[PDB]
Amino acid sequence: FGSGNVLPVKIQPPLLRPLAYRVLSRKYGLSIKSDGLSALAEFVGTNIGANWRQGPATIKFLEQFAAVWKQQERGLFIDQSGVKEVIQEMKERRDYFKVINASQQQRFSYNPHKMQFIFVPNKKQNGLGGIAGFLPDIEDKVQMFLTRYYLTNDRVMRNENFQMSITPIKNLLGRDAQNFLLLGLLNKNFKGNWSLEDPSGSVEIDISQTIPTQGHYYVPGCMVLVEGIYYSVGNKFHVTSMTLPPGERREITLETIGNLDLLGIHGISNNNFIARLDKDLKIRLHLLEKELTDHKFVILGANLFLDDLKIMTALSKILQKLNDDPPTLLIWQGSFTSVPVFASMSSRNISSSTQFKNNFDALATLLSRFDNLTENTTMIFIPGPNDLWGSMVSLGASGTLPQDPIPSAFTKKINKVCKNVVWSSNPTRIAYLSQEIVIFRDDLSGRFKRHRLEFPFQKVQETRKLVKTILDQGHLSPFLDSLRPISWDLDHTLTLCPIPSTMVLCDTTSAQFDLTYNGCKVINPGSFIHNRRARYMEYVPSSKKTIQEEI
Amino acid sequence: MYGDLGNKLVLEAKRTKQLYARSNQDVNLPMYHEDIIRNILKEVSNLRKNTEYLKEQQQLGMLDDKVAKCQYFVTLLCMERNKRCLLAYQRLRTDILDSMAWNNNGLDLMSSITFSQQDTNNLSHQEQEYLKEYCDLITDLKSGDLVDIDLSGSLVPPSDVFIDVRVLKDAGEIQTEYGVFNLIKDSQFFVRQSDVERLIQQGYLQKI
Amino acid sequence: KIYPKLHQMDMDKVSRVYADLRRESISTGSFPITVRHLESILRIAESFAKMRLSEFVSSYDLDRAIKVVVDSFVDAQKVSVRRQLRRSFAIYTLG
Amino acid sequence: SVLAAANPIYGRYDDLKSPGDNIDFQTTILSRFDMIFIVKDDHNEERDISIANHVINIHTGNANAMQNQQEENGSEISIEKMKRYITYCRLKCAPRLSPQAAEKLSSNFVTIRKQLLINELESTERSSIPITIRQLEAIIRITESLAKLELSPIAQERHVDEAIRLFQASTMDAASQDPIGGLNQASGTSLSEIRRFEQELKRRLPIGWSTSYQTLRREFVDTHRFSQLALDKALYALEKHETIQLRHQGQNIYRSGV
Amino acid sequence: ELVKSLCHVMLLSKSTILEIRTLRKELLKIFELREFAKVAEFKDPSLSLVVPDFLCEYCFFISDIDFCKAAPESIFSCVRCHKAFNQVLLQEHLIQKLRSDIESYLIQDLRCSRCHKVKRDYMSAHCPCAGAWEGTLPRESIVQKLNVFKQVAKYYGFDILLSCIADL
Amino acid sequence: WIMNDSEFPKINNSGVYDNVVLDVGVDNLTVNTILTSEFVHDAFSNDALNVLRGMLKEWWDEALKENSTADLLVNSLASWVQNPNAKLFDGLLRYHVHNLTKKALLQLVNEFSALGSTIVYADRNQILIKTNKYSPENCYAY
Ligand SMILES: [Zn+2]
Ligand SMILES: [Zn+2]
């Protein structure tokens, strides 16, 4: 705040504290600590020449120091940071974008009694966790599906059409007739019979004369709306109709939840208070469309193999063109190995972990050539089924959904050759200004096709069916714990109660598509190489996309 | 009949008033009643539908006017009663919020450090917004023509120049006009009353 | 006149004896043992302390009480298992 | 209010014999008790050591030197304070049920009254511990008593769940003694069919590997050997700690030992 | 510790129990300790971490290696033939053991605290019995297992397993 | 579950023994187990098992008649069984082999229990036996 005076005379704070006290402690603010007072002596002594008898200068300085403490939350006591806020003041006279992993995402529970979300303190911050702090507690296993049921039932009960209403199952124990609307998990009992389950209880289900609503998938492990008649001669709910819970747009969903900063980039929330913000959204929507079409981030075709030579040559040819106009973000996705890497008892050949390391060293050679792409592009690394830690147990199969990033030990100098590189979990959330994008990599179509209810009674239609099921169920894993185990405390990562604005859903078993639904956009990159053709697609935050091919 | 539910809401208000009346220290508002309020909203919507239906059924000319007037009046009166109950509940809750906002020396309340009297989730979102603008109004009052007088100061008359105080919570050295106070816990001070009013109000000192 | 106390004593020996007596009853025995028999050892220890006109119970009295209780249980068994039970319970009464 | 204590015939419960041969109280008197607790000893070593230490601390004087502290801090209150709290609560509050509480209670009554029918039909003899309308009114009273503690003017599902759990722990546990074997007319053919099925299962399935309840039902019942009472036969084989284990949400039946 | 470990060796006789137990009490009389004191009981000083079925390529031998009790010159060498092993293979096997243990904890079954039985519901609060749902594999066991791996990775130099511990 | 069960049972009877103790080493356990021998959902196919049995029998017979390659195949079969990198590898086969070896070891211990002796230890490569006699010089014939 100005310079060029004679020299910084040194004076003791005793002759400075009365003015600061009257301006701060009396009127607005308080707690000028002794160390903070000594800190506030240097900057006022920088322009000390001909002052303490002057006019506005000191008062305006104290006013400006108060401006930070009204703006930032800070606290009460003034400490050695007092110079740190004046650095911000002189600062005053893209950004705000992040990539959130599964582990670093904030946790929020839901109270059905209160219709509201309650914060959960993270165990990493306060718990010691020096030896075992990531491990969940058994109580989460008991509430894992109860949390899903509560979220879906709230949405079903707030729909416009419903006001027959959904009845708890145990309310059917004495009735011999009438109709009921039951909502619950569809599964198989320990006896092998199809059944429906809600927190109240369970009931067996008869499909012998069921007429389902075509247009979506009926896989065990998902919420289903059902209608029929209950017979007390046995215990059977004879079904006459079957559907899935309706979906809800995020604009109508946000108002119910207020303005909670779930993926909070505005700020953070703790056990004391939560954060909301509305006025900034308009101006940042303005900035999103303020002639920023130059931003360009690219998702490559999934499942690219580094060990193969033709794939590496095709990637070099693709980066040749990417060098010309550097993408804003470049997301390398899919399994980076063509074979699962396991303990490899045979040591006659070179170890598979060392081979994994070596295959990540050729990337440095191929990438160091293109200096501009290093200089002004950020790369996002998505894991796959055959990466290091998972394949040590699953041996190439698909297991736990929250998949940890690639270890930093076997990939070390790719952080040097490239400028911005971030490793991310299998499900991740890119927060770009007023936009949330979800990155997910698995084969969904095969598992849907294999597991269907099969009621006793052009290929792009399957894509619409998959999109509708995934979006209406509001969850990325419409499956029981048997088909796919889930980390108990990380399940909130996989629940889409607010529908994401943009979705990255790659499946090698499903053809590429571009669909729109209730307030979102779903794109499907897949099969990096196909029919001797290497494909990769571009997407722009202004909701336009392009497909670029290089044999 | 139609308004019989709203009476329950009013009853709840009465209970809150008692907690406001029998309050040696500041208290917290109970949970909001969005479910009951939504029930009155649903029934007044049904009353609006009934009034519409009466409008068409009269304007096709199947019913006598004297007959239709009675149900018209009944629906209007029920809606008026429901409005009265809701407004009374809202005004009582608003008055308590205003009292708390004044009794924290202005400030932004929940965003900044609060005296922990109230939990965040008790208040409704509109109430949370209202509290914010009311606090801003207090703030730009305190910077008006009455700068010298602290409009959020103590409201008990001054009658003791020198008082004995005891520290409740530990802290560091704090500068005051022409001196320093060292807040070592379990220590006693004999000092002028004006210097320690702020610290007593914020819970760092005891006695007077 | 006398009212002895139990300030310093070996809790572990008494706990082990009680647990062993409880175990060796349901397995092979028809003498009911409950928490009510744990307190009898302490009562007999206090009685032996009274015999000496002492105001504090020592280790000898507690050991003697344990021996009395163990001998009262072993000798009410069948002739088949008595020899095994006596050997199994003999470690506690070393003195 | 009545608080009663008694011993069974023969002194101990004698779990080997029938419940009707153990309780000498008629159905007329047993229907006027809201909660009935049957108390048994399990003879576990860990519990025996814990109880022994707790009792020795009482005798050696270490009891009081602890208790006062907790009574001081936040965890216990004196007899007079609790007496005054009881009288204040009884003279001030009298809670009422909510519409959802009645719905949750009716279904529980229907369930606990249905179960008795299956038990009586299986054991072909009447139950010694009866379930009646008084047992519904008892759960209502327990719910309101739980609400009374907090001076709440309304009883809700939170109290209903705890009242139901207390009733299950007290009276349904006593009713459901689940005799392993009584050698009575009930399951008379089972006296040999149990051994028959055990041999057929242990010859089919070696000490390793597993099967399913679906298959063990379909294939072993196609030969018309079903008895409708094989649900507890698997659990009885499990009780041997070697024949049967149940895993994977009860779907998987694993042979674990001889 | 010397006197306790010396008496424990004598105690394994099953035929001279009384004679050894008298001497133990007499020796414990030198110290101010009683014969049944908890501080005077013997416990095994060492834990165990057994990796099963390791192959010797030049020997065709199946051996189970325990990384805690076994002395050196045996961890890194085959028994039948004194041929050295390859260390990174050992580290990879240890990592496999750790990840498999974590998976096994994550896919366990629930039980009633009183009715030792399996939970057969996806959404329930407790047993039909008034009880609670507890785990078949308690957390303390897996915590101790993660504890021992850290010490094993630090006594011998295993960089890969040390990195694997810190990425959790 | 079947790919996470690689632990073998053991016997560790402890004490001080004043009789003679024998330290025998049992080799060829797995090949002996293989050569000797609907409802079940966790078992390997019996036909392929019999094919493998016949293969091992013929290999052993030719190995007896001074064949180096047959001896190498017989020695390397056990290594082949447990290796996933080897093709045609099935986890059910490994579980089947381990489960039959587990039964075979217990049967061998029971067979030793037929004569006066007591097992002390068992580790698939070392077995310790307690004899009735008191002097080592008198156990040559037994
Ligand atoms: Zn070797
Ligand atoms: Zn239970």
Side-chain angles (χ1 to χ4, degrees), chain B residues 6-14 16-17 20 29-38 40-41 81-100 122-131:
Chain B
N7 192 2
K8 279 189 100 205
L9 191 67
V10 177
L11 273 166
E12 287 313 290
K14 204 178 176 163
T16 304
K17 188 63 161 314
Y20 192 41
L29 282 72
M31 294 299 291
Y32 195 83
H33 286 88
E34 186 265 330
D35 52 354
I36 303 102
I37 291 172
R38 101 177 76 187
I40 296 89
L41 290 191
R81 180 68 178 172
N82 282 280
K83 180 177 76 174
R84 187 170 181 201
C85 296
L86 270 161
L87 274 181
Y89 189 69
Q90 198 64 77
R91 197 143 171 279
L92 162 72
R93 293 186 68 86
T94 287
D95 263 347
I96 305 183
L97 289 176
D98 291 331
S99 199
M100 294 183 286
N122 290 304
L123 314 191
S124 194
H125 307 290
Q126 304 104 310
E127 299 189 309
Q128 288 150 23
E129 189 273 334
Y130 169 94
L131 194 78

Side-chain angles (χ1 to χ4, degrees), chain E residues 112 114-115 127 129:
Chain E
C112 168
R114 314 141 171 201
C115 299
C127 177
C129 178

